[PDB]
């Protein structure tokens, strides 16, 4: 609804997600369970509380 999935950059610790044909970039954050730990890992941005998780599980 207000969540967008994408993939994270290990080097940049960011999540890139697509919305309406437009890429957006958001900081994964520094928490050990939120930062990007593996390049291209599934990540999700929650628009509502402006939350990011770059360790989205399967």
């Amino acid at each position: 609804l207000s969540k967008f999935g994408g993939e994270c950059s290990l080097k940049h610790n960011t999540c890139t997600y697509l919305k309406g044909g437009k890429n957006h970039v958001v900081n994964c954050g520094s928490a050990a369970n939120k930062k990007c730990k593996s390049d291209r890992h599934h990540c999700e941005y929650d628009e509502h509380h402006k939350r990011v998780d770059c360790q989205t599980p399967v």
Side-chain angles (χ1 to χ4, degrees):
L1 281 195
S2 323
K3 282 190 190 63
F4 311 86
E7 92 185 33
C8 73
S9 165
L10 179 65
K11 156 198 217 153
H12 294 130
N13 195 32
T14 50
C15 181
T16 290
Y17 65 94
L18 193 51
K19 174 176 175 173
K22 296 206 181 343
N23 274 332
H24 295 281
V25 180
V26 292
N27 168 37
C28 298
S30 64
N33 72 319
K34 296 287 182 251
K35 66 179 182 178
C36 188
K37 279 167 94 45
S38 147
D39 209 33
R40 298 177 308 271
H41 198 283
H42 198 131
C43 58
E44 301 236 316
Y45 173 57
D46 187 338
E47 229 177 29
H48 188 243
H49 217 67
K50 295 182 226 103
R51 284 312 280 101
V52 192
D53 188 338
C54 293
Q55 296 174 35
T56 307
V58 203

